[PDB]
């Protein structure tokens, strides 16, 4: 892995349940057998969307957690674990969606203004999830839902390994900037979603709070606004993305725009910990979307991410740290393209995100954005998961591997692995002052023969005059590896004579000793 490290010892593989209720896909008894099959293939737990639309459909405080309890019961019967997602967003309308569960229709009647939903640059209304600006409504509703959910599920604490929160559309903390109705679906630029009167008012008040008066606003932005009502979000999204973002106005607008998501993150994290820490005491997390298109568009740099709300990932992740929420990035199986017209750089995106997360000490989890039908995508996921310190990987989705033994087997081999500590010892290494020693191998867990950025470092043992390292390896998987030497300048000086192997890596911690 990067930084002379290896795979994360806490790595776990997860399986996404279907979007629709289990009975609409199969039966509970078969489902229990599926779970056992999943566990046998290296899956630690099943993640599942519990839709707000299903749990509080009829009206405020009219809960129904029976499906969830029933699901949990079967999970318990299979001797499995589960990760509930309190899906406060609509199922249907997003990529891969095979469902139709809008959030409770009554919620939209909690306000007479337009504070609850989103409106795009062109007026497209979106009601997939509550507008995070309506923090008062969010605090109440989410607080009540989380609290009631905790009580109803308390007797199933034993099978709940983690709890996920939904920070926006598709269960991700972002704005609904890429949708078919708004004409912003991949791979087009996204449209900003701050055009409801309420959003314009909030931005206006935020700006005036920051500078005090319009006169000071005009001084800071170098503008000549005639009235406070002239303080508005971008009137021309395209022009803003081309050059407007560079101005002090642009920086302020984006700070506010992303800031809303950061505050929302802190709010839901607070509400979740209050409702769950005592009852379950398990990690809590939220998701960030991989908006990889328009990444390197020369004309509109990161033209899809900024409208989605992603302007500064470092700053965004800090909010997750403050809220004590683990992060899941949802797009690891893709390769960089960076070519017209999509300007897609998903791999670069994931690496940057993973790097920030690791630096900040944020538990990082990953998912594949689209269904995987080939082993190559699994290898791409593995390269990212095992070289960028991911603590977990969740496969979308259930059916793809449950009904494809071939694919299921590839997954077990490459991603359904159990990490195990092992000591690697290499003797008679002809190193000189300044040299460092590393090992690299065939599997992703070993850096896939990369010597530049993914090798695993070994350390000299002056007591035994050899080089050693405690490495995390995939249990019961065959491996091939070789130690090699890097000079002070970082140049690879030489390699170990014979290629080593472990067929397979022992389940119990031990050591592998070989000579250079
Ligand atoms: O069961 C959990 C949730 O499952 C669904 O949400 C998934 C979604 O299906 C999945 O695609 C994803 O990854 O999120 C991002 C993704 O990271 C982005 O890349 C992008 O997807 C685009 C593709 O990358 C691109 O190649 C092309 O296909 O266009 C895609 C969409 O424009 O956008 C999505 C955001 O939706 O993760 C989520 C979260 O698990 C389901 O929708 C959701 O309701 C469930 O909660
Ligand atoms: O709120 C002030 C004005 O903001 C926008 O205008 C921005 C524009 O979005 C940006 O691309 C450019 O670089 O700067 C101007 C401000 O000088 C709105 O479009 C205007 O209607 C607002 O008055
Ligand atoms: O680059 C992929 C191959 O890496 C190694 O091959 C090394 C070899 O170990 C070393 O002794 C020699 O000097 O250089 C080659 C090429 O870098 C693995 O041993 C191979 O299995 C990989 O395919
Ligand atoms: Ca309520």
UniProtKB/Swiss-Prot annotation:
EC code(s) of this entry: 3.2.1.2
Binding site residues for substrate: 49, 89, 97, 287, 292, 330, 368-369, 397
Outcome following mutation: residue 164 to H: Reduces activity by 97%
UniProt effect for mutating residue 164 to Q: Reduces activity by 80%
Keywords attached to this entry: Calcium, Carbohydrate metabolism, Disulfide bond, Glycosidase, Hydrolase, Metal-binding, Polysaccharide degradation, Signal
Binding annotation for Ca(2+): 56, 60-61, 141, 144
Catalytic activity of the protein: Hydrolysis of (1->4)-alpha-D-glucosidic linkages in polysaccharides so as to remove successive maltose units from the non-reducing ends of the chains
GO molecular function terms noted in the UniProt entry: beta-amylase activity; metal ion binding; starch binding
Active-site residues, as the UniProt record annotates them: 172, 367
Domain CBM20: from-to ranges: 414-516
Disulfide cysteine pairs (residue numbers): 91-99
Required cofactor names: Ca(2+)
SUBUNIT field: Monomer.
Similarity remark: Belongs to the glycosyl hydrolase 14 family.
Protein name (database record): Beta-amylase
Gene coding for it: spoII
